[PDB]
């Protein structure tokens, strides 16, 4: 409980957004949704991985992979885990997939994702 918290995961979400932006424009350019290396690749540098990204700005949008203010770089799992890619942050414990995570499903993004 407190204020930090609260500035800290807002920094996550900014990232999380940035980090689904990259998905997005993957997918803009390649027709679908990047892999687990190639997501968070996609906000840095053209993945290698096939297809080759293209129309990707020079340097990326961050010129490193956007890590969790403690230190910990974030992850993508394709397929997801409630959608087609989920992205989840790894908090100051740096576990992935835990209860932490900070994930587009835990902000609220995750939506218009429904068959029902
Ligand atoms: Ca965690």
Do not use: C
């Not at 992850?75 to 209860?99: A, T, W």
Request: proline fraction near 8%; hydrophobic fraction near 30%.
């Amino acid at each position: 409980m407190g204020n930090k918290e609260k500035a800290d995961r807002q920094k996550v979400v900014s990232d999380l957004v940035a980090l689904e932006g990259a998905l997005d424009m993957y997918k803009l350019d390649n027709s679908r949704y990047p892999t687990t290396e190639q997501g968070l690749q996609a906000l840095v540098s053209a993945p290698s991985a096939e297809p080759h990204a293209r129309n990707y700005p020079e340097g990326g949008y961050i010129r490193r992979l956007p890590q969790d203010p403690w230190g910990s770089d974030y992850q993508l799992l394709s397929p997801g885990q409630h959608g087609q890619v989920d992205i989840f942050s790894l908090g100051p414990d740096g576990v992935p997939e835990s209860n932490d995570d900070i994930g587009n499903w835990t902000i609220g993004f995750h939506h218009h994702h429904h068959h029902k």
